[PDB]
Design a binder for this molecule. Sequence first.
Ligand SMILES: *C[C@@](*)(O)[C@H](CCCNC(N)=[NH2+])NC(=O)[C@@H]1CCCN1C(=O)[C@H](N)Cc1ccccc1
Lengths: 27, 253
Amino acid sequence: ADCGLRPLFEKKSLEDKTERELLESYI
Amino acid sequence: IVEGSDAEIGMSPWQVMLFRKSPQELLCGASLISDRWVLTAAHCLLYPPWDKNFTENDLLVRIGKHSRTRYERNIEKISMLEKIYIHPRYNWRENLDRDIALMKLKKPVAFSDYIHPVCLPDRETAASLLQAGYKGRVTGWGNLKETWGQPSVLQVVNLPIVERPVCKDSTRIRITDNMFCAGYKPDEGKRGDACEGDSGGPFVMKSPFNNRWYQMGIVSWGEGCDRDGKYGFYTHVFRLKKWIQKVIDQFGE
DNA sequence: GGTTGGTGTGGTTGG
Ligand SMILES: *C[C@@](*)(O)[C@H](CCCNC(N)=[NH2+])NC(=O)[C@@H]1CCCN1C(=O)[C@H](N)Cc1ccccc1
């Protein structure tokens, strides 16, 4: 259902110090 | 993990640590793909060539960790395996083809700030994401160097998916379609990789479709940790979903 | 385990 959406990261519209590396890949 | 960092709290609500009863030690990582089912690499449970043959009995699942060492007193949660299912074509002899195993927990894991399941790859997401140069995220309490020494904490590393072929001229091992390799290239001037301890580890992705995270890989093998010219072989979770979804949908949670 | 605080999320250097 509500898979892969973190209650402290996605879920409070914050992102990790490295997440960003990952969507900069996909260019 | 090799050449990586501390996981920040709640960076992987999914990440599970599966680790021995007696002696009380760690054997692998798992990912919680739902309140009752856990995804691990099989070789964690069975490698006849070293006597690995653990049983629902001899193994322990512990969800919501952070520290390697301490028992996270009010976040960390320990569970009872009801059954394990190795994949019929698991090939422990040769090269680890569909080196996967599900295991269904005794009773359902309550979800939390800390416990949350990952997304399982849809055919679609699989199409768009699994591509070379694209980064993915691997995690765990594994050796810090191939040899020595271990984290007191969950390490996380960001590695790039490697070209299908490149993988190949890396290892004489007979590589297959239920295998994807991942790494920084010799010269790509960036490092990290999984390690002896890591296995079953989720190798996740974030669809910028919905911003959900996806398990794509699983830690499988490769030669050493961070060998210049070597790349970690994960498990095409996708590639093997149907068997994956057959069972959950057969006797699953 | 280790700085009675923090995901070793209370209040017992352990458990
Ligand atoms: C259990 C594990 O976590 C581990 C994953 C480590 C892989 N290293 C890197 N950098 N990705 N798996 C293993 O060590 C497996 C299980 C048994 C042997 N093995 C290996 O990866 C060997 N190092 C190589 C191998 C030998 C025979 C068949 C397949 C692979």
